[PDB]
Structure formats: structure tokens, C-alpha cells
């Protein structure tokens, strides 16, 4: 992606078991170096469902704890998200269809909603 300030995933955790640290960083500084601001986390391995649960028809979840307001601010000041980060943001509902590339572009089953 382009930019000087960039919203991206810094890798954390152990071998064969990654967790990600959503940051805003300089383009030049290293992948796992200390960034400008950590916005959130992201574990890519989804929460494992029970056999009964699977039979019923309940999907796994990928947990993504995230400072929404901060992220929005960073987007506003023009910090370009990475290909994965931008997708994540789109999924959340911060970013619009505008950011969706041609490769991404299928009936929806479950719609988004804010809860408490």
C-alpha cells in the first residue's frame, strides 16, 4: 500500500500460533517494531465450535478488539490501511464499499449490528 502513516498488522505470539496487533506505523519502520499507536488486536484462528453447535448451524468467530474512534481519526488524517486491515475495517463497518478492490467485490445470510 501507499503512504507514510499506515494502519497494518504487527505480528505477535509464538510459532504456528499467530496473534496480530493492529497498529498505525511509519512505512519505513520494521514490521514488529514499536509503532505510533496500537489500535487493536486480531487473532486469525477462529473460536472452535462444539459438534452439537456445528450441527445446529452456528459459525465460528474471529475476535477483533479495536479502538473504533481512534481508527476513524487515523483514517481521516489519511493513514492508508493494509490489504488485510482494510478488509477487517470494512467487515466491522468503519470503511465503505469504496475501499473494496476488484478481486474482493453472493447472498448475505447475517447482517451487521451494534450490540452491548
Amino acid at each position: 500500500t501507499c503512504g507514510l502513516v499506515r494502519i497494518r498488522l504487527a505480528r505477535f505470539g509464538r510459532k504456528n500460533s499467530p496473534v496480530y496487533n493492529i497498529v498505525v506505523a511509519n512505512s519505513r519502520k520494521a514490521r514488529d517494531a514499536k509503532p505510533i499507536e496500537v489500535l487493536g488486536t486480531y487473532v486469525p484462528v477462529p473460536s472452535p465450535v462444539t459438534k452439537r453447535e456445528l450441527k445446529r448451524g452456528v459459525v465460528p468467530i474471529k475476535d477483533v478488539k479495536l479502538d473504533f474512534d481512534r481508527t476513524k481519526y487515523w483514517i481521516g488524517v489519511g493513514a492508508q490501511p493494509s490489504e488485510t486491515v482494510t478488509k477487517l475495517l470494512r467487515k466491522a463497518g468503519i470503511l465503505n464499499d469504496a475501499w473494496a478492490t476488484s478481486k474482493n467485490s453472493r447472498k448475505v445470510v447475517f447482517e451487521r449490528m451494534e450490540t452491548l
Binding site: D69, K72, Y73, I75, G76, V77, G78, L95, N96, A98, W99
Partner: peptide, 19 residues
């Protein structure tokens, strides 16, 4: 698409500052 992106960035930065 660019216009939409711009609008979104305006919204966010405006909100952020005001907040």
C-alpha cells in the same frame, strides 16, 4: 469511489476533532 472516500475521511476527522 474517490469522492466517497473523501466524504468518509471528512466525516471521521470532523467527528474526531469535535469529540
Amino acid at each position: 469511489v474517490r469522492l466517497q472516500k473523501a466524504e468518509l475521511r471528512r466525516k471521521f476527522l470532523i467527528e474526531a476533532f469535535r469529540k
